[PDB]
Design an enzyme around this catalytic site. Structure first.
Site, PDB file in Angstrom:
ATOM      1  N   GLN C  11      31.251  35.804  40.126  1.00  0.00           N
ATOM      2  CA  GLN C  11      30.803  34.468  40.605  1.00  0.00           C
ATOM      3  C   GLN C  11      31.415  34.204  41.981  1.00  0.00           C
ATOM      4  O   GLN C  11      30.656  33.822  42.885  1.00  0.00           O
ATOM      5  CB  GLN C  11      31.205  33.374  39.614  1.00  0.00           C
ATOM      6  CG  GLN C  11      30.933  31.964  40.123  1.00  0.00           C
ATOM      7  CD  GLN C  11      31.705  30.905  39.376  1.00  0.00           C
ATOM      8  OE1 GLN C  11      31.970  29.827  39.902  1.00  0.00           O
ATOM      9  NE2 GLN C  11      32.075  31.200  38.139  1.00  0.00           N
ATOM     10  N   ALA C  12      32.729  34.382  42.132  1.00  0.00           N
ATOM     11  CA  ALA C  12      33.436  34.171  43.416  1.00  0.00           C
ATOM     12  C   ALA C  12      32.954  35.214  44.425  1.00  0.00           C
ATOM     13  O   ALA C  12      32.765  34.842  45.598  1.00  0.00           O
ATOM     14  CB  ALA C  12      34.926  34.256  43.200  1.00  0.00           C
ATOM     15  N   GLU C 183      44.913  34.616  34.270  1.00  0.00           N
ATOM     16  CA  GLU C 183      44.548  35.141  35.593  1.00  0.00           C
ATOM     17  C   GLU C 183      45.676  36.024  36.084  1.00  0.00           C
ATOM     18  O   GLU C 183      45.349  36.925  36.799  1.00  0.00           O
ATOM     19  CB  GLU C 183      44.184  33.994  36.512  1.00  0.00           C
ATOM     20  CG  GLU C 183      42.861  33.368  36.172  1.00  0.00           C
ATOM     21  CD  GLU C 183      42.358  32.385  37.208  1.00  0.00           C
ATOM     22  OE1 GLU C 183      43.158  31.968  38.064  1.00  0.00           O
ATOM     23  OE2 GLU C 183      41.177  32.045  37.151  1.00  0.00           O
ATOM     24  N   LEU C 252      35.425  52.693  59.476  1.00  0.00           N
ATOM     25  CA  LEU C 252      36.286  52.293  58.366  1.00  0.00           C
ATOM     26  C   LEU C 252      37.609  53.047  58.396  1.00  0.00           C
ATOM     27  O   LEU C 252      38.660  52.481  58.071  1.00  0.00           O
ATOM     28  CB  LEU C 252      35.567  52.521  57.037  1.00  0.00           C
ATOM     29  CG  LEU C 252      34.142  51.968  56.944  1.00  0.00           C
ATOM     30  CD1 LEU C 252      33.595  52.148  55.538  1.00  0.00           C
ATOM     31  CD2 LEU C 252      34.094  50.504  57.355  1.00  0.00           C
ATOM     32  N   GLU C 254      39.182  53.864  60.970  1.00  0.00           N
ATOM     33  CA  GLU C 254      40.013  53.226  61.984  1.00  0.00           C
ATOM     34  C   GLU C 254      40.856  52.112  61.376  1.00  0.00           C
ATOM     35  O   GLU C 254      42.019  51.928  61.753  1.00  0.00           O
ATOM     36  CB  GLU C 254      39.139  52.683  63.114  1.00  0.00           C
ATOM     37  CG  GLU C 254      38.318  53.750  63.822  1.00  0.00           C
ATOM     38  CD  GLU C 254      38.099  53.443  65.292  1.00  0.00           C
ATOM     39  OE1 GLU C 254      38.213  52.261  65.678  1.00  0.00           O
ATOM     40  OE2 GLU C 254      37.811  54.385  66.059  1.00  0.00           O
TER      41      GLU C 254
HETATM   42  N1  LIG Z   1      37.261  31.038  46.869  1.00  0.00           N
HETATM   43  C1  LIG Z   1      36.565  31.041  45.732  1.00  0.00           C
HETATM   44  N2  LIG Z   1      37.175  31.204  44.561  1.00  0.00           N
HETATM   45  C2  LIG Z   1      36.304  31.181  43.526  1.00  0.00           C
HETATM   46  C3  LIG Z   1      34.946  31.009  43.565  1.00  0.00           C
HETATM   47  N3  LIG Z   1      34.393  31.050  42.299  1.00  0.00           N
HETATM   48  C4  LIG Z   1      35.417  31.252  41.525  1.00  0.00           C
HETATM   49  N4  LIG Z   1      36.606  31.313  42.198  1.00  0.00           N
HETATM   50  C5  LIG Z   1      37.914  31.559  41.616  1.00  0.00           C
HETATM   51  O1  LIG Z   1      37.817  32.777  40.934  1.00  0.00           O
HETATM   52  C6  LIG Z   1      38.601  32.753  39.724  1.00  0.00           C
HETATM   53  C7  LIG Z   1      37.698  33.020  38.547  1.00  0.00           C
HETATM   54  O2  LIG Z   1      36.722  34.018  38.907  1.00  0.00           O
HETATM   55  P1  LIG Z   1      35.153  33.839  38.660  1.00  0.00           P
HETATM   56  O3  LIG Z   1      34.438  34.370  39.826  1.00  0.00           O
HETATM   57  O4  LIG Z   1      34.846  32.453  38.211  1.00  0.00           O
HETATM   58  O5  LIG Z   1      34.898  34.836  37.453  1.00  0.00           O
HETATM   59  P2  LIG Z   1      33.896  36.039  37.151  1.00  0.00           P
HETATM   60  O6  LIG Z   1      34.224  37.091  38.098  1.00  0.00           O
HETATM   61  O7  LIG Z   1      32.512  35.530  37.129  1.00  0.00           O
HETATM   62  O8  LIG Z   1      34.280  36.399  35.643  1.00  0.00           O
HETATM   63  P3  LIG Z   1      33.704  36.199  34.143  1.00  0.00           P
HETATM   64  O9  LIG Z   1      32.882  34.988  34.129  1.00  0.00           O
HETATM   65  O10 LIG Z   1      34.920  36.044  33.435  1.00  0.00           O
HETATM   66  O11 LIG Z   1      32.955  37.389  33.735  1.00  0.00           O
HETATM   67  C8  LIG Z   1      39.314  31.397  39.746  1.00  0.00           C
HETATM   68  O12 LIG Z   1      40.589  31.516  40.361  1.00  0.00           O
HETATM   69  C9  LIG Z   1      38.356  30.544  40.574  1.00  0.00           C
HETATM   70  O13 LIG Z   1      38.983  29.420  41.149  1.00  0.00           O
HETATM   71  C10 LIG Z   1      34.322  30.849  44.810  1.00  0.00           C
HETATM   72  O14 LIG Z   1      33.131  30.737  45.038  1.00  0.00           O
HETATM   73  N5  LIG Z   1      35.221  30.906  45.857  1.00  0.00           N
HETATM   74 MG   LIG Z   2      31.377  34.122  35.866  1.00  0.00          MG
END
Ligand SMILES: Nc1nc2c(ncn2[C@@H]2O[C@H](COP(=O)(O)OP(=O)(O)OP(=O)(O)O)[C@@H](O)[C@H]2O)c(=O)[nH]1
Ligand SMILES: [Mg+2]
Ligand SMILES: Nc1nc2c(ncn2[C@@H]2O[C@H](COP(=O)(O)OP(=O)(O)OP(=O)(O)O)[C@@H](O)[C@H]2O)c(=O)[nH]1
Ligand SMILES: [Mg+2]
Lengths: 38, 430, 437, 171
Positions: C11-12, C183, C252, C254
């Site tokens: 997601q992040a 985490e 890369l 580099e």
């Molecule tokens: N900077 C930033 N941090 C994010 C974002 N989305 C989630 N996070 C952070 O990422 C962590 C959780 O990861 P996620 O990306 O939500 O999880 P995932 O990788 O989808 O994992 P699962 O749902 O468990 O399969 C937390 O610390 C969140 O605050 C984003 O868009 N930007």
């Molecule tokens: Mg997720």
């Protein structure tokens, strides 16, 4: 380059590599083929 | 994982189940007919988590009404929202279980579990990806406890990887006057710790004390008990019925609120406290709500959080407010009342905000805690159980139905080892 | 000419990759549909911007990304977004069940079912390239999926493409934005798994971004939308050499040769300056010496550390705007004569200057102003090791009580993995401390 | 209930009154009693000694639950003093061939049954100032002296499945 780093770190890296290799070998020897998931 | 099947056993479980459905329907705008009539898109963004889409854009419930007698089954079908459910989702017998765990877990329950597992697989078949289960039953009644714990075991044996959540309602001598309720309660625990993953503790003594002392009621009724149980259910599941990032699914909620396999009993709390036919025009501020939600008086269990240590805390604030103020208040509460929080699980207090306050209230607050003080709810049961089992009183009802003293010994031992583990984890690194 | 293949999982990871691609096309002039009016050659690709974009015989400039998610949520947003016509349906992979914050459930359970699909997409895309440099993977330590599936993909690529770099842009956890108490476990696990499979990984302390958004940008409640817009700018400034006619870090290798002296010490420290709000845009213009002095301030640093206490091994800077080499050299000399910057005895003590005459760029309606000149300083400082120190504080207090360990045991993962990862982290900390001598 | 109906309406079941008065709505409620007490009483007659032991050895002993296997083993032990010849001549060799099957649960059940039969034969011989080798012929002595050795030859003691073989060999 690796030459710039002293041998103090290279020796520790080699020791850690040997240790993890021995641990992996022991784990594989202790495993069972009739109980794996893959 | 995007569909949850609802189940309800026993009279109290069915009544608690019917109230929660009515509450979530009134909050989502789903009239008794089944058509949407709310005023917010968020109500429809997560409507498929509990309802099913049907011709004409209708939302059919996904619950299963289960009993061993017909009284409660007819009471819910004839209720104000009774028409909402499915005519083939009502599965009941004629004789009941007579406040006997054995009769409800080995005879009538063991015979009706076949049909129960027929409607259950019917709801799981109409689910793109089942997420878990949410049963509503009581630990005091025979049919409500025995056959319901028999449905948890059957689901855990059938569905391998599925979350299990229940809303156990612990009885209380103040409400009921039945003598075999201590036995019907202890055994149930012996199953939960070895079957269910999440379980909310809703002690009846706490509800009675809150209705008789706080709300000022000379004769608190079962109508007042269901008014407090349904609000708690709507508050604790507000994250699963609306958008959110903290606890959107059941697996995340379990991973965040279950630090150990056996330890998963969560005492819920909701504020401000209200009753039927009462409208509070005064809107409490955010600090007042945060201070009242953590008060022992607003707890649904007969346990004082101050006399213990917290493990996992989850707070939800429903109402138009600011997030910075809520975060500051939570930080201040964590700093001041820091002695009541274990320091060996960092970041163990989560806070969430929602833009959909309950009906009849502009500002609401919720509390799902995992403090070790919940052990007090079991110690009380222990005394009664031991006192009644040492002289052999009303035991022929169980031994004469296949059970034996070994099961009672086993359940007593499991419950006693759960208390010792709680006490030990409470004094970790003393 | 060579081209890279970027990957965004989680997601992040996907949410940041979307903003990066938006910013990349925003700078290249590529329209949302994909047509590039500035490109006169149809079907042929041999420019600087072709490293991150392919070209169809109609004109369309398709990215080289791999958007894989274990649940239909974030992928749907980009599929029904503004740049859905930018990517192809095949490059937008989607699963079903979510890991639910668990490295084991994503590495030995729900990740071993979709790994082959992602690998077949990573082979079909590479077949359409005469030369490949490496893989730029975007993930996060907080998300269990980003710790399991990303690690599995990296391990599989290390065996498949055993002669290609794998640059990374991980995201470090912060309590003001976090939603999982597990985490640290997944973070340590993915770190131990990727320590032997990556060349250079840049960290992004969420606390630093939150502070920059609350102080500089003047935001009351910075959201994931604002953080993604501020991290995308830095991600683009770092990869500006691989997309423009520059003279530093063009490949890369580099990066690894100029910022990763010790193979295991590959976590540089990035900083970007200036960061002025949109309201204070047309106010004052800071010179190069103004944005070079603020780069050293911990307020602008991406990680909450104290480089002044430690020393440096390598350092470089990438400018963007009307920057003159003489002014940059004078500013560097002044900073060296003033600040007491110390370097390692066995490491070279010089700054790799690389100016880019292209002006900065910002998304319309964004909190960041259109500054006349910007700079991105990447320096490998031992103080960054402190960022890991506190992390271990969250692993010993919990693991000592065997908290949240059943989730991994019941998912096929062994218990000795935690001890092995902790030993690896301790060895890394010992090596970091020894390098400081 | 079916047995009671057949005994009351037909009266052709051997020892219907006895098996109907001991095994009823109350006595049958307990499973331990049915597997250890009532079982011996019903098998006391020659019309239920062979089929009961056969079913216990070819089904209950090879169940999919350890509790059911232990209950069947205890039942065979209790029913090994009402039929020493049949337990030492047709069931014991029957178990020696099943102790080497590929199935883990089957091997465990067969080992438990063999141990129980040996213990019952020893207890029976102790009450007649005679050794246990009289009932357990050279064939039995050989197989019993080959349970632990053969198991180690196939590294069967390794793994979770090997833990149950280790426990069975210890017992
Ligand atoms: N900077 C930033 N941090 C994010 C974002 N989305 C989630 N996070 C952070 O990422 C962590 C959780 O990861 P996620 O990306 O939500 O999880 P995932 O990788 O989808 O994992 P699962 O749902 O468990 O399969 C937390 O610390 C969140 O605050 C984003 O868009 N930007
Ligand atoms: Mg997720
Ligand atoms: N809060 C609450 N408790 C209830 C309610 N109805 C019953 N109880 C409690 O539940 C216990 C009795 O169990 P029942 O629900 O009547 O049992 P059952 O599931 O119907 O089982 P059988 O009576 O054996 O058929 C006592 O502790 C009651 O006080 C109710 O509506 N609300
Ligand atoms: Mg009833």
């Amino acid at each position: 380059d690796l030459s710039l780093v002293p041998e103090r770190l290279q020796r520790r890296e080699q020791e850690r590599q040997l240790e993890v290799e021995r641990r992996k070998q022991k784990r594989q020897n202790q495993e069972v083929e009739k109980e794996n998931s893959h | 994982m995007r569909e949850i099947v609802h189940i309800q056993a026993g009279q109290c479980g069915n009544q608690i189940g019917a109230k929660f459905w009515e509450v979530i329907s009134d909050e989502h705008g789903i009239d008794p007919t089944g058509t949407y009539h709310g005023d917010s898109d968020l109500q429809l963004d997560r409507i498929s988590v509990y309802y099913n889409e049907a011709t004409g854009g209708k939302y059919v419930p996904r619950a299963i009404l289960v009993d061993l007698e017909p009284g409660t089954m007819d009471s819910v079908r004839s209720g104000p929202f009774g028409q909402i459910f499915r005519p083939d989702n009502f599965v009941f017998g004629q004789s009941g279980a007579g406040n006997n765990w054995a009769k409800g877990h080995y005879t009538e329950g063991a015979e009706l579990v076949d049909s129960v597992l027929d409607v259950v697989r019917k709801e799981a078949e109409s689910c793109d990806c089942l997420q878990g289960f949410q049963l509503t039953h009581s630990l005091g009644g025979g049919t409500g406890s025995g056959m319901g714990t028999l449905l948890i075991s059957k689901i855990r044996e059938e569905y391998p990887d599925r979350i299990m959540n229940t809303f156990s309602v612990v009885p209380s001598p103040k409400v009921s006057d039945t003598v075999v309720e201590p036995y019907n309660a202890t055994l149930s625990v012996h199953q939960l710790v070895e079957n269910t993953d999440e379980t909310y503790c809703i002690d009846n003594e706490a509800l009675y004390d809150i209705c008789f002392r706080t709300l000022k009621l000379t004769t608190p009724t079962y109508g007042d008990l269901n008014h407090l149980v349904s609000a708690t259910m709507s508050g604790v599941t507000t994250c699963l019925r609306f958008p959110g990032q903290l606890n959107a699914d059941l697996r995340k909620l379990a991973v965040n609120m279950v630090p150990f396999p056996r330890l998963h009993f969560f005492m819920p709390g909701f504020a401000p406290l209200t009753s039927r036919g009462s409208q509070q025009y005064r809107a409490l501020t955010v600090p007042e709500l945060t201070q009242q939600v953590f008060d022992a008086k607003n707890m649904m269990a007969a346990c004082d959080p101050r006399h213990g240590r917290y493990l996992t805390v989850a707070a939800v604030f429903r109402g138009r407010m600011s997030m910075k103020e809520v975060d500051e208040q939570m930080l201040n509460v964590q700093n001041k009342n820091s002695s009541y929080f274990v320091e060996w699980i960092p970041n163990n207090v989560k806070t969430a905000v929602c833009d959909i306050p309950p009906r009849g209230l502009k500002m609401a607050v919720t509390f799902i805690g995992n403090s070790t003080a919940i052990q007090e709810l079991f110690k009380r049961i222990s005394e009664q159980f031991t006192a009644m089992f040492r002289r052999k009183a009303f035991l022929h009802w169980y031994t004469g139905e296949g059970m034996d003293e070994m099961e009672f010994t086993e359940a007593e031992s499991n419950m006693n080892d759960l208390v010792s583990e709680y006490q030990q984890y409470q004094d970790a690194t003393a | 000419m060579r081209e890279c293949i970027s990957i965004h999982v989680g997601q992040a990871g996907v949410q940041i990759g979307n903003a990066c691609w938006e910013l990349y096309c925003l700078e290249h002039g590529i329209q949302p549909d994909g047509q590039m009016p500035s490109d006169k050659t149809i079907g042929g690709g041999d420019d600087s911007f072709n490293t991150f974009f392919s070209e169809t015989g109609a004109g369309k400039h398709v990215p080289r990304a791999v958007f894989v998610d274990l649940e239909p949520t974030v992928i749907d947003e980009v599929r029904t977004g503004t740049y859905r016509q930018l990517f192809h349906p095949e490059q937008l992979i989607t699963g079903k069940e979510d890991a639910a914050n668990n490295y084991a459930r994503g590495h030995y359970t729900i990740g071993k079912e979709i790994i082959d699909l992602v690998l077949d997409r990573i082979r079909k895309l590479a077949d359409q390239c005469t030369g490949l440099q490496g893989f730029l993977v975007f993930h996060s330590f907080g998300g269990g999926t980003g710790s399991g599936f990303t690690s599995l993909l990296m391990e599989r690529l290390s065996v498949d493409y055993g002669k290609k770099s794998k640059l990374e842009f991980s995201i470090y956890p912060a309590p003001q934005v976090s939603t999982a108490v597990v985490e640290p476990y997944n973070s340590i696990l993915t770190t131990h798994t990727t320590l032997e499979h990556s060349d250079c990984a840049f960290m992004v302390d969420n606390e630093a971004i939150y502070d920059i958004c609350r102080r500089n940008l003047d935001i009351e409640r910075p959201t994931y939308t604002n953080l993604n817009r501020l991290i995308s700018q830095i991600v683009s400034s770092i990869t500006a050499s691989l997309r423009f006619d520059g003279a530093l870090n063009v490949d890369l290798t580099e990066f690894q040769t100029n910022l990763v002296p010790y193979p295991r010490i590959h976590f540089p420290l990035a900083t970007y300056a200036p960061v002025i709000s949109a309201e204070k845009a047309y106010h004052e213009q800071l010179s190069v010496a103004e944005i070079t002095n603020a780069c050293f301030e911990p307020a602008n640093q991406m990680v909450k550390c104290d480089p002044r206490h430690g020393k440096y091994m390598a350092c470089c800077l990438l400018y963007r705007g009307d920057v003159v080499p003489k002014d940059v050299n004078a500013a560097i000399a002044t900073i060296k004569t003033k600040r007491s910057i110390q370097f390692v005895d066995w490491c070279p003590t010089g700054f790799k200057v690389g100016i880019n005459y292209q002006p900065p760029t910002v998304v319309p309606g964004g909190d960041l102003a259109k500054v006349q000149r910007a700079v991105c300083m990447l320096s490998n400082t031992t103080a960054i090791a402190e960022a890991w120190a506190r992390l271990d504080h969250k692993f010993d207090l919990m693991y000592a009580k065997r908290a949240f360990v059943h989730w991994y045991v019941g998912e096929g993962m062994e218990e000795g993995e935690f001890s092995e990862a902790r030993e690896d982290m301790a060895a890394l900390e010992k090596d970091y401390e020894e390098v400081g001598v | 209930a079916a047995f009671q109906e057949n005994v009351g309406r037909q009266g052709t079941f051997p020892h219907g009154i006895d098996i109907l008065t001991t095994a009823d709505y109350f006595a049958v409620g307990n499973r331990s009693n049915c597997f250890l007490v009532i079982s011996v009483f019903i098998a006391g007659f020659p019309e239920y000694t062979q089929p009961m032991i056969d079913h216990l050895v070819t089904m209950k002993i090879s169940h999919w639950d350890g509790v059911i296997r232990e209950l069947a083993a205890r039942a065979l032990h209790n029913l090994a003093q009402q039929a020493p010849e049949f337990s030492a001549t047709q069931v014991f060799p029957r178990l020696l061939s099943m102790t080497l099957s590929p199935d883990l649960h089957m091997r465990h059940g067969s080992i438990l049954a063999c141990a129980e039969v040996a213990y019952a034969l020893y207890k029976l011989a102790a009450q007649e100032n005679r050794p246990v080798t009289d009932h357990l012929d050279e064939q039995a002595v050989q197989g019993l002296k080959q349970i632990h050795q053969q198991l180690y030859d196939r590294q069967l003691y390794r793994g979770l499945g090997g833990q149950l073989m280790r426990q069975a060999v210890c017992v």
